[PDB]
Design a protein around this ligand. Structure first.
Ligand SMILES: O=c1[nH]cnc2c1ncn2[C@@H]1O[C@H](CO)[C@@H](O)[C@H]1O
Ligand SMILES: O=c1[nH]cnc2c1ncn2[C@@H]1O[C@H](CO)[C@@H](O)[C@H]1O
Ligand SMILES: O=c1[nH]cnc2c1ncn2[C@@H]1O[C@H](CO)[C@@H](O)[C@H]1O
Ligand SMILES: O=c1[nH]cnc2c1ncn2[C@@H]1O[C@H](CO)[C@@H](O)[C@H]1O
Ligand SMILES: O=c1[nH]cnc2c1ncn2[C@@H]1O[C@H](CO)[C@@H](O)[C@H]1O
Ligand SMILES: O=c1[nH]cnc2c1ncn2[C@@H]1O[C@H](CO)[C@@H](O)[C@H]1O
Lengths: 241, 241, 241, 241, 241, 241
């Protein structure tokens, strides 16, 4: 303890009760934009940090790059230091081609544990599940902002480029009703459950991994405001030490 | 198809939209009692079936005995035939000795997948997670009936009597924040997710597996009414074909 | 210790040296019938208990319902308390369609460990195997009562209703020469080996899981008498403390 | 087909109905000695082959060296070509230090599947179990020759020299009642079950893997004669095409 | 195909035969500095791309951020497009506290496969191994530049922050002689082997994961020049289509 | 300690710094022949031992029979007693039918860990990898003796005779670029890494496991001399205590 965070390279007194984590640090800037005010905090490797101010409340907006071990070090440094709520806003592909299309929004409550990091944390029998509150508040912002959302189960797969040798299960989990595929959410949920952190997550359909071989920015605008609004909503309760 | 259900030995036209499943068929009778009216339907092996009527609505109350493969055949026969919502009310032991004590009530949203049946259904990377709606409605009945509840993660272990040779993980999952231990809930949740059935579950603390070596019926009364009330609440939406 | 058995709800002084366990408690009654005399002992959940008297000997007849975790608690309470021999009589489906047909009888000596409960007890490298004596005595009663039997390997699968996603192995084990499929026998055998209890089991072909998509009570009568006779035979040795 | 056996380097018309397989080819010679007459057949790598003649019957005596993949190729070439019964006589160490001591004899009926070869054949849920007949005949020769035997479960471990890093399970399986430890028997049993070959096995206690850090040839004589006598006994039934 | 690379956001005609991949894009700039000339190519998320020119040769210098799934998408986009050789220069911690200290340099030839991405590519029985040539050339640059190096096995663990519940194996692999711990190298090696790409890697000791609870830039300078020199050396062979 | 080696039945003062291990003890004799002088040492079970003298140096030539557990006891007794370098010369089948044909020679540097013995030693995440030096010296003898060699990855499978039930992976590993299939090399490499022993291996193509259903002795002569020459080369460094 002194002025730590090893990877975020921010201080432990800059960690707020609520955090919004995204993957691409250029989108920390596109979110920076719609807020009321901000404080840029640090930019180390894939990890751009920032104090966002929206509707009377402050909360970080921090990016974890692509994939679970790298995202895990970010989530881990947050909870060790005092994030109470962590919502991920990001992108995903559709596992339901003709129901979930490009630009639709899912608010996901559980995910498939297809990394390895959580498995080095807890036995794979464990659920990766978000917290209901976070999931409920996120859901009603959608409804107050009059914006359709799906809800569902996401598969957090570490293989982005499947292979000719082993069965990629994604069809398996499609037939099993999972809605979307992304890379980081199971990890968030497992760490959170372990360290007592309420997590949640919302995602915009980029594409469908099944038809790779073959505007949204409006929806992108909606999704940020649902996520910003939820963080504001959720930061309220803790505001005052 | 004719007058099927192989194990429940009821008809496919007796399956309602909502079902309440418990473990012990003698408690199908203690629930039978607090309802407004009933129709006894069948009693085969561990599987006592019944049409419950409460607050203007009808729904089955069906028992699956002790453990997952046997409970699985019950849950499976229900969804194949048209249950849309299945809430389990039951008993559990505490994994948090000095916070969750005898008689407390958990409304659980996820569970550890420590059977085998779900694993023969889907890969263990999959979450066993209840549906939020079912979980929300169950939660607010508790609050309208002014009755404290915990919420949490349950471990559905198949070993009731642990052994001298292999590590029982229950301490593992305690340290991991899981609240209670029971035997059947992961299975319900996985089948449901697979067959498109909203599930949920609520449980009364019987004891603590950790201090085995060493009134509630009021709470039992509360828990039934929270579960009966939720089924009534949840059956409302489907009522009318 | 006082008047225990938690699930059987019988006393520890009512546990005999030999026990006959079946699945359906209504068949504890159909066996009750052919004996010379009986003492009904307790009926709790899926667990009907009974003192059977046949050919000069006494032995329990106790039912474990459908599936392994639930059956496991029954078997476990028996050995902890003093059953020395436990034979299961039950039903099974054929894995060999055109050799093992409806009504044939197998006396099985080993099984596939497709539960989870034994795996929480011992590593899956372990055999589930009956004891030879029990298996020999059971076999020669068949021959003294002039009644054909198959012998074989049973698969104790926890999935009764296979799925569209994962490979059910039953064809795998058919090609591997396994004779029949049931749900509880591996568990019995593993617990027994662990707690020093001789187990065995015999089974009547109900059907074939492979042609689901498409009198015996005489054989049922034979099988009970082979099992009753074996228990009598086997109880003899211990009779006198 | 012409004059095959790739590793035994004997002909397919030299394979008899019964075979006795041991590990060390120098003990094929010590068995060669007590027979009535013999025909030496081939000696390739670890695989010495021989036609034994005892009490009016002929049967091979063939050695598979140390360990399962190498033994597996031997067992496999036998069944593919027409061995109907295969008994292994060998050595083992005690897993029960103060009950099973140096020179005692076990007739084993099941084993732990701690190789890999069987697992590339069948799923590890499968039992490695001998055939009862083979096991019964072997047992009664012991009793006709007035020679004490234990019966039991053997662990067929591939690690002879355990390590400082991973848990060797041998204590695990001791606490679980397994009697002895050897290297090849599970494989025999699994292949046999797969290819429809009755197998069995008997073993003399060499030592105890647990006290490594700290006459029998009479018993060795007994064990051969129990095994020779069983092969004679068992070859009788097939004698005459 | 047109102007692809989805994550590197460079063109397929900008991919050279040799590539040097590091983790932190700020170190793509510190390497940019010691070269003779460069061409900055793209900067997308964690992925800064660059044409380096050193000793008469050109080769990319591309960064994959922290962890395997995210690094995997980088490595994958390279080989799909035509990298023939990929050397990773990075950082690691010591698994041998009192032999491998802060600032020492390992040239590693194999690694432990403690991700998940490779396992979705190939069965975990597969080695993660570098190519000998790459490893030899890297080694002799060290010796021509008169700079001590260790050689060894690296563990590519996805858990950076170990946990209170599951055994972190790092001690296990220490006792097993592994030299250093990092996060990305196994993946590189496995993808490469799969797509026919020679890989290698060299690493500077940052610290020791075992004493966390308790100048180098010279060595950092050496390591770049060993890696730059190797890439130059290795690019030579392909130079001329 | 006195005159140990339990299986090799040689003394601990007869173990040299370098050892050449082959599988078939009749090939210990065909190697015995091309040397300058020898000392026959012991012949126990599958384990023929011998002091070879070639180009001024001495080194053992010791045979481990067919398969990994049996080979493992040989390798293990060597390192425990003081072998510093162990090269295996043997045979293999081709996984690349139309590139690697009958009589070609591979010098292999890694292998697939498809035994069980190494897995009882270390976690399967571990690489089985030879040492570079051994691999380099072996490679340049080939080039000084003007004899083509492939280099590659070998699969050390324990199943020689694949089955009708489970997927043999060999096609899997072919598609993955593995060059040849044998039975013992992964074990050597893993033990060596564990006990600090440099290992290596070279192999002549006997056939192709894929076309089983359908002179070299010159190459055999070359391969021995490459292996003998390497052992001579490698023994040089240690020669003089
Ligand atoms: O089809 C997909 N598979 C996996 N991840 C995806 C997909 N679509 C979007 N993402 C998300 O976007 C990033 C990839 O650039 C990943 O971080 C993942 O979270
Ligand atoms: O401590 C416990 N471990 C496992 N299951 C329990 C426990 N307490 C209550 N149940 C629940 O009650 C039945 C057992 O009779 C089981 O069905 C289980 O669901
Ligand atoms: O085809 C079958 N699969 C699985 N179990 C079976 C089958 N047939 C009979 N049983 C046996 O009967 C009960 C099912 O009602 C189960 O307890 C099982 O033991
Ligand atoms: O303590 C033991 N562990 C493993 N195998 C043993 C033991 N004792 C005897 N054998 C048997 O003897 C050979 C070893 O030389 C092995 O083939 C094994 O079958
Ligand atoms: O002790 C360690 N454990 C795991 N990875 C490490 C360690 N030290 C250095 N790295 C390397 O540096 C980055 C972490 O910021 C990771 O990318 C890893 O590759
Ligand atoms: O196609 C093959 N599969 C497996 N092992 C082989 C093959 N060809 C050669 N060997 C090698 O030769 C011996 C078999 O007699 C085995 O020891 C193995 O190392």
């Amino acid at each position: 303890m002194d002025n730590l965070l090893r990877h975020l390279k921010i201080s432990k007194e800059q960690i707020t009760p609520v955090v919004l984590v995204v993957g691409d640090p250029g989108r920390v800037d596109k979110i920076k934009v719609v807020c009321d005010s901000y404080v840029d905090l640090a930019y180390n490797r894939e990890y751009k940090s920032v104090e966002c101010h929206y509707k009377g409340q402050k909360f970080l907006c921090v990016s974890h790059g692509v994939g679970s071990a790298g995202c895990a070090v970010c989530f881990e440094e947050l909870c060790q230091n005092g994030a109470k709520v962590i919502i991920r806003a990001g992108s995903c592909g559709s596992l339901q081609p003709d129901l979930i299309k490009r630009g639709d929004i899912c608010i996901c409550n559980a995910a498939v544990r297809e990394d390895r990091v959580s498995h080095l944390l807890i036995h794979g029998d464990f659920p990766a599940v978000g917290d209901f509150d976070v999931y409920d508040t996120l859901n009603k912002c959608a409804q107050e902002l009059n914006v359709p959302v799906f809800n569902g189960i996401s598969v957090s797969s570490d293989m982005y480029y499947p292979n000719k040798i082993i069965p990629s299960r994604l069809e398996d989990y499609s037939k099993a009703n999972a809605a979307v595929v992304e890379m980081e959410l199971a990890t968030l949920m497992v760490i959170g459950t372990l360290r007592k952190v309420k997590t949640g997550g919302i995602l915009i359909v980029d594409g469908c991994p099944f038809k790779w071989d073959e505007l949204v920015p409006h929806q992108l605008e909606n999704m940020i405001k649902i996520a910003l609004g939820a963080c504001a909503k959720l930061a309220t309760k803790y505001a005052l030490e």
